[PDB]
Amino acid sequence: KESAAAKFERQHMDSGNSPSSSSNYCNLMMCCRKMTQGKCKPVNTFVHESLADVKAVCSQKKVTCKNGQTNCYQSKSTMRITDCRETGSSKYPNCAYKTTQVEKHIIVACGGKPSVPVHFDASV
Amino acid sequence: KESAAAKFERQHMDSGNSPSSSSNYCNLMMCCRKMTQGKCKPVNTFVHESLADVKAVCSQKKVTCKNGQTNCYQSKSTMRITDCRETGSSKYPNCAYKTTQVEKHIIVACGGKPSVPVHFDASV
Numbered sequence: 001k002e003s004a005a006a007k008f009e010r011q012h013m014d015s016g017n018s019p020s021s022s023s024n025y026c027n028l029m030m031c032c033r034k035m036t037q038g039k040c041k042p043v044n045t046f047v048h049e050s051l052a053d054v055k056a057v058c059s060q061k062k063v064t065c066k067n068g069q070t071n072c073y074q075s076k077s078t079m080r081i082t083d084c085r086e087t088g089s090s091k092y093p094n095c096a097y098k099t100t101q102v103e104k105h106i107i108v109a110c111g112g113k114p115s116v117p118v119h120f121d122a123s124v
Numbered sequence: 125k126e127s128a129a130a131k132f133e134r135q136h137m138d139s140g141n142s143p144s145s146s147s148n149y150c151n152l153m154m155c156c157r158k159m160t161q162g163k164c165k166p167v168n169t170f171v172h173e174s175l176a177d178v179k180a181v182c183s184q185k186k187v188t189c190k191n192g193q194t195n196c197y198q199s200k201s202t203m204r205i206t207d208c209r210e211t212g213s214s215k216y217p218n219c220a221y222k223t224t225q226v227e228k229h230i231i232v233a234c235g236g237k238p239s240v241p242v243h244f245d246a247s248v
């Protein structure tokens with residue numbers, strides 16, 4: 001069981017950061033969304049457009065998937081996204097990310113019926 | 125098994141106008157630090173001071189805990205803290221917090237050997 005001391009540190013300590021930062025977004029979000037367990041997911045993109053807009057990409061332009069599958073689609077317009085890229089100094093379990101605010105077209109793999117995004121392939 | 129659609133939403137969707145804004149700190153932190161599982165923790169304080177300074181509180185001013193326990197201590201000096209409190213709109217699983225940065229004395233319960241903070245009781 002997690003020690004009471006460790007629980008206090010988890011719930012109540014943030015010595016190394018503050019709210020006023022913008023650069024800590026990826027560190028917190030990758031943690032929040034469970035992509036830092038077992039290993040640090042090296043690269044991950046968050047999209048800030050509506051879910052409806054992102055879902056709509058599956059009905060937009062067919063493009064090549066980076067993995068050679070044929071289920072990828074590119075957004076008709078640029079989208080507000082944040083790229084989270086693991087830094088050189090990052091070392092599990094202390095997963096460190098550079099937060100980059102970007103506006104680019106996204107490419108998603110789609111699957112299911114209705115076809116919805118299942119994989120974030122790239123931004124272009 | 126988590127659906128592919130849900131996994132994409134978890135990993136890639138953060139719909140909104142200002143994801144990295146300071147106002148979002150508590151939303152990110154309460155999530156990352158595992159205080160939004162099952163229910164939204166209603167109130168939680170983060171401390172931005174050195175862990176050494178927070179541990180030092182266990183040797184400072186004795187004060188009675190809110191719950192009547194007798195192992196609480198108040199910091200001699202004010203500390204930089206962030207209050208996270210559920211908004212009137214917050215409803216699990218969509219927890220929502222107001223982030224408030226203040227400087228106040230902290231009150232913590234101290235336990236174990238070495239005697240260290242185990243519970244955050246109050247700010248004053």
Ligand SMILES: O=c1ccn([C@@H]2O[C@H](CO)[C@@H](O)[C@H]2OP(=O)(O)O)c(=O)[nH]1
Nearest residue numbers: 043044045046118119120121122123135
């Ligand atoms: O710009 C990018 C490029 C890659 N990725 C994630 O990393 C996986 C392998 O490239 C991509 O497939 C994707 O992870 P997945 O959706 O499969 O969980 C991004 O998130 N953004």
Ligand SMILES: O=c1ccn([C@@H]2O[C@H](CO)[C@@H](O)[C@H]2OP(=O)(O)O)c(=O)[nH]1
Nearest residue numbers: 011012167168169170190244245246247
């Ligand atoms: O992390 C925490 C947890 C609790 N509290 C104070 O204790 C009350 C009961 O949870 C919380 O309501 C709150 O007292 P209040 O500030 O509302 O007077 C904290 O201050 N920080």
